[PDB]
Design a protein around this nucleic acid. Structure first.
Ligand SMILES: [Mg+2]
Ligand SMILES: [Mg+2]
Ligand SMILES: [Mg+2]
Ligand SMILES: [Mg+2]
Ligand SMILES: [Mg+2]
Ligand SMILES: [Mg+2]
Ligand SMILES: [Mg+2]
Ligand SMILES: [Mg+2]
Ligand SMILES: [Mg+2]
Ligand SMILES: [Mg+2]
Ligand SMILES: [Mg+2]
Ligand SMILES: [Mg+2]
Ligand SMILES: [Mg+2]
Ligand SMILES: [Mg+2]
Ligand SMILES: [Mg+2]
Ligand SMILES: [Mg+2]
Ligand SMILES: [Mg+2]
Ligand SMILES: [Mg+2]
Ligand SMILES: [Mg+2]
Ligand SMILES: [Mg+2]
Ligand SMILES: [Mg+2]
Ligand SMILES: [Mg+2]
Ligand SMILES: [Mg+2]
Ligand SMILES: [Zn+2]
Lengths: 76, 190, 176, 47, 115, 137
RNA sequence: GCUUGACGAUCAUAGAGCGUUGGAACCACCUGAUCCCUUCCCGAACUCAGAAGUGAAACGACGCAUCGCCGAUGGUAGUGUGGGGUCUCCCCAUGUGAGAGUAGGUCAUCGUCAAGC
RNA sequence: CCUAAAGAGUAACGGAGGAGUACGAAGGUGCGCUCAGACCGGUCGGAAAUCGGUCGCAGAGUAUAAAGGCAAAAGCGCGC
């Protein structure tokens, strides 16, 4: 055999779902690339990480051309 | 003749529909189309299975009798068991006097014994297709479309534009700028 | 110049000769682009700026060196290497090059009854090849290096070649 | 047109053997004597 | 056309930033004859103050040149003040900030509102 | 023996065979067909063997279509070899068959002659079969 | 209430194509390259100064289902829980329920501001 | 990357591939621009060089495997 290799899992995915309360600096989604784009109140890390910039509630809206999926923070 | 009897179905679902085929010996069905709400009906398997070996079963017009209220329908689609082959579900399209409708019409090939490509050249005959999608008024819906293969030579192809049609009948696929081989002649395999 | 020749007689006569309804849709010529593909200088690289001077005196306008868009070793070239030069002309500068091309140089090439009236793309443009650069004046035969094949393309606002050829019948092109 | 990267462009003249004089702006800065033109070339005349 | 569509693509990047920051935008439009200026509220929704060369004190013809745009630039600042707005962002809308649009911008700065 | 000219990967997992065949269960090209009424898998040597037996019996005209293609590789570990130490090499190719799949089609022959020939082929196959005519729908 | 220009909401039931039409104003093509400015050359693009022509191209509106895009009802597949069989696989009770296909639908619907009637 | 059973994680001497670097610009910013390919026309090059036009929309590209991304292009060029 010449096959027995793999790599450690990176624990990617959504960390806070729709309706959850958020704080500034809270990480929302971990990605490779951007499945989700930064909406209102959210910022983008250098490894394509979505983090909250204000306090509120996750929205998870898809809108606009290109059919993009957006994560935004709204009023509580 | 082309008569079918039906009852108004009330129980919908997979479990209710699986019970008809097991205990009651009936067949679920639908009567949609026209300008009305769709109606779910039921009918006995041994009666629909006897109307289905008539050669002009799908290209003719049925006189459905739901309860005591009858009407004009047409076999629009059919569901069969993949392994055994009996019919499980069937839907009927209502027929309106002034409204274009579509159907599947089988082709009646004729006089293959005296084809020029067979009697002289010793070739074969291959039916590439056996029905054609049509579109016409209900009053002039044909039972079969007749294709004549008397003056066919070896290697000659027959397309949709070659065959004739009755009045007020469109071949649908031909209207889409797509005529395709109906039948042909070719040399024997061995 | 030929500017005076086009907008006073050529254009109005074409207006009725194509039976055109509107003035603005009368065909016209926009630009003249020459280039010359120097398949040489793959290992030389000295004649690239030499052919720059050759095409510079012909037009009175500085050319630019065009680079290879892909390596393809079949011709032993590589990306980023110079393959040729080119020029583009507009407005007065191309109605004065045409007049010199029309008759100061085309009669004196070597030969030919006329020009091929079938070198039209489906959209009404004309391109003609030149075998020897010496056909032009302003380059002395006694000073040049090896001969090279200048090229010519006529880009016009013609829908199809029928009025494109009709426009080139004006300016009295030598069509055999 | 940029400034001072292009050759000189002057009117000059062009005289042909068939008694033809034509004005055309080019880059010779001197009158020229020709040998052929449309007024005298064979295939431009009918031969 | 090709010319207008390309420019409207040039204008896209700047306008997307100005809604992320949620700032009031000063948008300029320049045509062959006239020039226009609008104060867009916060996201493209409502127009707060507006001015152009089409109003009934500039309908005289000298409307497509540098010193015609200067009178528009100062006028739009006044109407903006009556709406109680300041600290706006300038949207060249894909036009090069060199000529008539620059004259409009510089007049706006002297008008009182800040960029 | 039928088998793909080239494959993206050499090996495959065993998988499972489940469900009926709603697709590939209609007489599309020919006019008589041999349908499968039980599930299993044909080993591409039975498909080849059952095709000699079918064309030989008609022996005069007719057109024959084969609707099954063996595209799944299977492996066998050699003899006197322990468990583990990798996966075995590819031995042969099979085709997943579900109840209702049409295997062979024919036309240009009499109905009686079709019945004879399809009985010759069905005796070479490890699964129950049936004889099906053609319908409009 | 109507037309044109700018900025948005929504991203094809809104797009593609194929025909008809608009220049009083707006917009566009357009005239020229002295000045601001530009081209790895070129007033093609960017820019400036304009008012002789044309709505030809572009744009906008209006029409048509040909393509595209939406798309039911019913049936079918899968499936959580409990129980069975001939147990590689299915079945019954109960809750859930597609994808493809069929009848069919669509030549968008709104908001703010400025000009002309 | 698959196995991995639509949150995360999940073994085998299970099935397939890569790394032990590169870059002072291949980083920052401002401004500007869209690819591969096909067809037609053109001096020798000819299926394939450079040029003109039409169609095309990403089938191109990303320093380096594969996956996930890419119009404010994350792709390409220039000034500082
Ligand atoms: Mg591995
Ligand atoms: Mg392994
Ligand atoms: Mg692991
Ligand atoms: Mg993983
Ligand atoms: Mg940052
Ligand atoms: Mg159930
Ligand atoms: Mg940019
Ligand atoms: Mg296994
Ligand atoms: Mg399937
Ligand atoms: Mg211009
Ligand atoms: Mg669909
Ligand atoms: Mg349903
Ligand atoms: Mg259902
Ligand atoms: Mg559905
Ligand atoms: Mg994968
Ligand atoms: Mg997981
Ligand atoms: Mg799970
Ligand atoms: Mg473990
Ligand atoms: Mg290694
Ligand atoms: Mg990069
Ligand atoms: Mg950089
Ligand atoms: Mg080309
Ligand atoms: Mg863009
Ligand atoms: Zn002469």
């Amino acid at each position: 055999t010449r096959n027995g290799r793999d790599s450690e899992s990176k624990r990617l995915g959504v960390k806070l779902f729709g309706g959850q309360a958020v704080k500034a600096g809270n990480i929302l989604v971990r990605q490779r690339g951007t499945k989700f784009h930064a909406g209102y109140g959210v910022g983008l890390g250098k490894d394509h990480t979505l983090f909250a910039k204000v306090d509120g509630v996750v929205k998870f809206e898809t809108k606009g051309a290109f059919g993009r999926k957006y994560v935004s923070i709204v009023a509580a | 003749d082309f008569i079918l009897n039906a009852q108004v179905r009330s129980d919908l679902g997979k479990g209710a529909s699986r019970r008809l085929r097991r205990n009651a010996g009936l067949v679920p069905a639908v009567v949609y189309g026209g300008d009305k709400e769709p109606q779910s009906v039921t009918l006995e398997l041994r009666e629909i299975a006897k109307l289905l070996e008539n050669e002009a079963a799908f290209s003719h017009v049925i006189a459905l009798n739901v309860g005591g209220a009858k009407e004009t329908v047409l076999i629009k689609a059919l569901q069969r068991h993949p392994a055994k082959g009996f019919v499980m579900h069937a839907d009927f399209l209502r027929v309106v006097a002034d409204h274009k409708l579509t159907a599947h019409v089988p082709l009646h090939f004729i006089n293959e014994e005296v084809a020029v490509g067979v009697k002289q050249a010793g070739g074969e005959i291959s039916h590439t297709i056996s029905e054609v999608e049509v579109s016409c008024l209900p009053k002039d819906l044909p039972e079969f479309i007749e294709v004549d293969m008397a003056k066919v030579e070896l290697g000659q192809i027959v397309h949709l534009s070659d065959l004739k049609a009755p009045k007020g009948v469109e071949l649908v696929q031909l209207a889409h700028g797509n005529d395709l081989a109906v039948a042909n002649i070719h040399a024997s395999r061995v | 110049r030929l500017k005076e020749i086009y907008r006073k007689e050529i254009a109005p006569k074409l207006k009725e000769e194509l039976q055109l309804a509107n003035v603005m849709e009368v065909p016209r010529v926009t630009k003249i682009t020459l280039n010359m593909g120097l398949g040489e200088a793959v290992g030389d690289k000295k004649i690239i700026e030499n052919a720059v001077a050759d095409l510079e005196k012909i037009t009175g306008q500085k050319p630019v060196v065009t680079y290879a868009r892909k390596s393809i070793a079949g011709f032993k070239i590589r990306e980023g290497w110079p393959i040729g030069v080119k020029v583009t002309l507009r407005s007065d500068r191309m109605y004065e090059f045409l007049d010199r091309l029309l008759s100061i140089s085309l009669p004196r090439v070597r030969d030919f009854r006329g020009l091929n009236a079938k070198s039209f793309d489906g959209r009404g443009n004309y391109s003609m090849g030149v075998k020897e650069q010496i056909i032009f004046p302003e380059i002395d035969y006694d000073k040049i290096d090896a001969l090279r094949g200048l090229d010519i393309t006529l880009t016009t606002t013609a829908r199809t070649d029928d009025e494109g050829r009709a426009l080139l019948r004006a300016f009295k092109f030598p069509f055999r | 047109m940029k400034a001072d990267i292009h050759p000189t462009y002057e009117a000059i003249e062009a005289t042909c053997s068939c008694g033809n004089v034509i004005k055309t702006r080019s880059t010779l800065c001197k009158p020229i004597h020709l040998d052929v033109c449309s007024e005298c070339h064979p295939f431009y005349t009918g031969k | 056309s090709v010319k207008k569509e390309t420019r409207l693509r040039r204008a896209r990047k700047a306008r997307l930033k100005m809604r992320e920051l949620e700032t009031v935008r000063l948008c300029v439009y320049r045509s062959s004859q006239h020039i226009y200026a609008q104060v867009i509220a916060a996201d493209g929704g409502k127009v707060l103050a507006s001015a152009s060369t089409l109003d009934k004190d500039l309908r005289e013809g000298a409307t497509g040149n540098i010193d015609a745009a200067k009178k528009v630039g100062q006028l739009v600042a006044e109407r903006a003040k009556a709406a109680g707005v300041t600290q706006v962002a300038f949207d060249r809308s894909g036009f090069k900030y060199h000529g008539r649009v620059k004259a409009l911008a510089d007049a706006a700065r002297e008008g009182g509102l800040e960029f | 023996m039928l088998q793909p000219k080239r494959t993206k990967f050499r090996k495959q997992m065993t998988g499972h065979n489940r469900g009926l065949a709603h697709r590939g269960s209609k007489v599309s090209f020919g006019e008589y067909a041999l349908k499968a009424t039980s599930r299993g898998r044909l080993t591409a040597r039975q498909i080849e063997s059952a095709r000699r037996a079918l064309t030989r019996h008609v022996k005069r005209g007719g057109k024959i279509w084969i609707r099954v293609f063996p595209d799944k590789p299977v492996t066998k570990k050699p003899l006197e070899v322990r468990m583990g130490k990798g996966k075995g090499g590819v031995e042969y190719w099979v085709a997943q068959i579900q109840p209702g799949k049409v295997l062979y089609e024919i036309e240009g022959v009499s109905e009686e002659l079709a019945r004879e020939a399809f009985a010759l082929a069905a005796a070479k196959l490890p699964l129950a079969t049936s004889f099906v005519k053609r319908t409009v729908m």
